[PDB]
Amino acid sequence: MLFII
Amino acid sequence: LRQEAEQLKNQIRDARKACADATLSQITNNIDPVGRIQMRTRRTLRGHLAKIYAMHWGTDSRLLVSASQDGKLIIWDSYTTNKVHAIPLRSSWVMTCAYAPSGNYVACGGLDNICSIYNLKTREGNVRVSRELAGHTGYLSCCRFLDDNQIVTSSGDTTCALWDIETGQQTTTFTGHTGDVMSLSLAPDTRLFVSGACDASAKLWDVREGMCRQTFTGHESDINAICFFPNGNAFATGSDDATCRLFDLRADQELMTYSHDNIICGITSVSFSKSGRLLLAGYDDFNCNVWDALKADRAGVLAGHDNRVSCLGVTDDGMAVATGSWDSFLKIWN
Amino acid sequence: SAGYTVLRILPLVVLGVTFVLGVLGNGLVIWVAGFRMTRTVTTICYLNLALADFSFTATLPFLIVSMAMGEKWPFGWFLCKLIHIVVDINLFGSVFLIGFIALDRCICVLHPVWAQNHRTVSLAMKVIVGPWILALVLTLPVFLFLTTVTIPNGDTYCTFNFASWGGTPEERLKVAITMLTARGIIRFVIGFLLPMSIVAICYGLIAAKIHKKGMIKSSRPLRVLTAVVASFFICWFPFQLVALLGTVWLKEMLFYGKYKIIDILVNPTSSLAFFNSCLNPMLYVFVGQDFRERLIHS
Amino acid sequence: SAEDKAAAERSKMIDKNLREDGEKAAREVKLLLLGAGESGKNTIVKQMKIIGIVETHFTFKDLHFKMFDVGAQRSERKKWIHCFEGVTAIIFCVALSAYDLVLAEDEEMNRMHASMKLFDSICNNKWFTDTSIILFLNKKDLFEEKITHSPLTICFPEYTGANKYDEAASYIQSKFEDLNKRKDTKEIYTHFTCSTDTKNVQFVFDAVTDVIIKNNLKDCGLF
Amino acid sequence: ARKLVEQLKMEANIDRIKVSKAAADLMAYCEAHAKEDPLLTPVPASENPFR
């Protein structure tokens, strides 16, 4: 879910 | 006949005035009050899926029978919350249940007009229909076991009858009530019993003779509860007028009234402790009230039931007081 | 810039009020429904949603303090892994539970006979724990491909690392970009398209049937339905749209960084999604009259 | 302790059977019938008797119904009327051709007025504040021919006229619905007892289905 | 009519002990059995089977 790059 | 009947009724009141010297509360002012009783829910029996209407305490103070309109009769091990039996009732509309003093029979009754006795000591291991008492036109309101052979059942047809399980037929029928009988209690010696009916009257019945030995008229609404004092010389009736009234068999008097202004709801079930000092009565205000039987001082409250409490029983040993309500849970107090 | 400073400070207070409201509401819902009334399929779904939201908001302050300092993670590798896994699992489970409640209400409305007969407690538990298995399956990349990375400057950011899996900078970069694209596609489709289509269709059919059969004696049911649909949309659609835009243009962002608006736009969208998660107990559970009566009696 | 474990294992086995039986008890529709005095209660059950309180259980369109008859209960109703708190619906039976007829027990009180008093009592009953009532007006075939001979002035003096089956049945149906003081929460599904096949049970299935939907939406917060 | 009168006459001939005597006698039973009433006098948890 979380947009982690 | 009509002219003398009115005087005969007044004669009972006229003789009552001479007997009425001092009230129970007046004499018992000097005694030490009980005070406040703090009872906590030790166990909560969560096994029912419908409203619970009646329960009976066993003589061993370990096993109790619970009746709910789910179609199941459950024998509860109050010490460990263990279900000894789960009797599938033929008719789900059950409003009363009884437990034999020996412990081998349980009888349930309701709107089906049949008092069914179940055998808990079957050799196979499953409870079977021992008997089905038919002969009551009105709904079964309360049934109490004199012994394994004889049972007395109160019905909504205004007549309560004594039955024999082995015979299967009415040994005798007690008549004299006006309204529908709602509650019935047995004496310790099982030689007498009383029946609470809708005409706000309590009648003392002799089992052997089969006739009304004594009549008490002190209530004002439908009497839903009744229970003898442990000594057997007095009893208290819980009616719909929010007043518990104590009647003395030997005095033909209203001993004292247990009423409060904060309560206006009816009384479903009443019972006495082992010593009879604590009159624990269920109410329609979703909680139970402990009443001092000698001074009418509320000695405690048993709040915690989600729905209306319908059945309340004190075990013979006095260890616990189990109260069942319409939320499908039984609570064990102390 | 003054506007950018406000644009960065606002998510902090948004997640703060989100954490407070979510913890309070989920605790109340669990304590009331899961312990003070009989078990029901709708009750089971409400407890599942409350547990998911509570477990999400319990770890929310860690994310709050992480993004308070430019996404730096002050804690250790194990704690970062645990918190990220819990957050992802709770978010996926909450979205799946919203979709499942929509589907269950649609089944109860369209085919009341099936709900009366074939909807039982044990089947409800099985088909309510199935979505948790799906959430764990979707979180598996977070289980595997997440490690703590420390930059030479000394700051630490526990993000997706690929040195061990690839072993070659070109191969590692290719694996990174393809896994990130797959994760973005999975999030967009299963996380958003699957439930939103379910929620819109299921609540739409309920509204269509209730209008055709005329059970609408007040505006409250329609208000509740439109509130559920509008809240879910306006909260999750911005976040999923920003994530999709970032994933499709992730090559440019990693190589050059042409689209830098997504990097600063993720935070408000995540804040709004978390606000949806925290308002779910109020929007789904507190609407019922029985729960309100039990709470006021408590 | 091994001995307690065996006793505890019995409780778990009993607990397992209780919930399985509870599922079967909760998947059946419970219906209560009221209205005595040849009101058509016996007539209604005949079309829907495919499979104390007279309990009949029949399944229509994969939905199980469990009907209860309390006609034999001649005691006080309010002492046991709380036992049915929670039924899906109450099927009330009224004889349409009863305005001229008078009760056998009391010859000074009209039979039709007695039906409304009992119908109003259960509408005003505290145990049925939310349960819908599937009102049934029986003997419509006998009513359509008796309407011409005897007008409604015997029962309802405040009748405008139009002594026809269509006009009088609607007025009688509307009069019963006016007794429902708890509006917006109880819906009266009035119907005329038709002799056609499967039509009488279809209305009950349709009425129960609507009640099930309303009950389902109430529990989920939609209502 | 006749049955009601007969029942009234049967209960009219019973011996009605004075309520003051009955009240005193009823209190005596409570005093004697108060020592064995767990509800009136709570007992330690060892004696109670309910913990």
Residue numbers in the entry:
A (entry chain L): 1 to 5
B (entry chain B): 7 to 340
C (entry chain R): 19 to 316
D (entry chain A): 6 to 56, 184 to 355
E (entry chain C): 12 to 62
Publication excerpt:
In response to the N-formyl peptides from microbes and mitochondria, FPRs play crucial roles in host defense and inflammation. Although FPR1 and FPR2 share 69% sequence identity, these two receptors display distinct ligand-binding preferences. In contrast, FPR2 is promiscuous in ligand binding with recognition to a vast array of ligands with diverse sizes, structures and functions, ranging from small molecules and lipids to peptides and proteins, which enable its involvement in chronic inflammatory diseases such as AD, systemic amyloidosis, and atherosclerosis. In this work, we determined the cryo-electron microscopy (cryo-EM) structures of FPR2 bound to Gi and four peptide agonists with diverse sequences and lengths, including Aβ42, fHN, and two formyl peptides, N-formyl–MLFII (fM5, derivative of bacteria-derived formyl peptide) and N-formyl–MYFINILTL (fM9, mitochondria-derived formyl peptide).
To enable structure determination of FPR2, a thermostable construct was generated by introducing a mutation S2115.48L (superscript indicates residue numbering using the Ballesteros–Weinstein nomenclature) and truncating 5 C-terminal residues (E347–M351). The side chains of the N-terminal formylated methionine in fM5, fM9, and fHN and the residue D1 of Aβ42 insert into a conserved binding crevice between helices III and VI at the bottom of the ligand-binding pocket, forming contacts with L1093.36, F1103.37, V1133.40, W2546.48, F2576.51, and Q2586.52. In the structures of formyl peptide–FPR–Gi complexes, the N-formyl group, together with the main chain of the residue fM1, forms a polar interaction network with three charged residues D1063.33, R2015.38, and R2055.42 in FPR1 and FPR2. In addition to the conserved binding site for the N-terminal formylated methionine at the bottom of the ligand-binding pocket, accommodation of the formyl peptides is mainly mediated by two hydrophobic patches in FPR2, which act as two “arms” to stabilize the extended conformation of the peptides. Residues L/Y2 and I4 in fM5 and fM9 form extensive interactions with ECL2 and helices II, III, and VII of FPR2, while the fM5 residues F3 and I5 and the fM9 residues F3 and I6 face to the opposite direction, making contacts with ECL3 and helices V, VI, and VII. A similar conformation of the receptor extracellular region is shared by all the FPR2 structures solved in the present study, despite the diverse sequences and lengths of the peptide ligands bound.
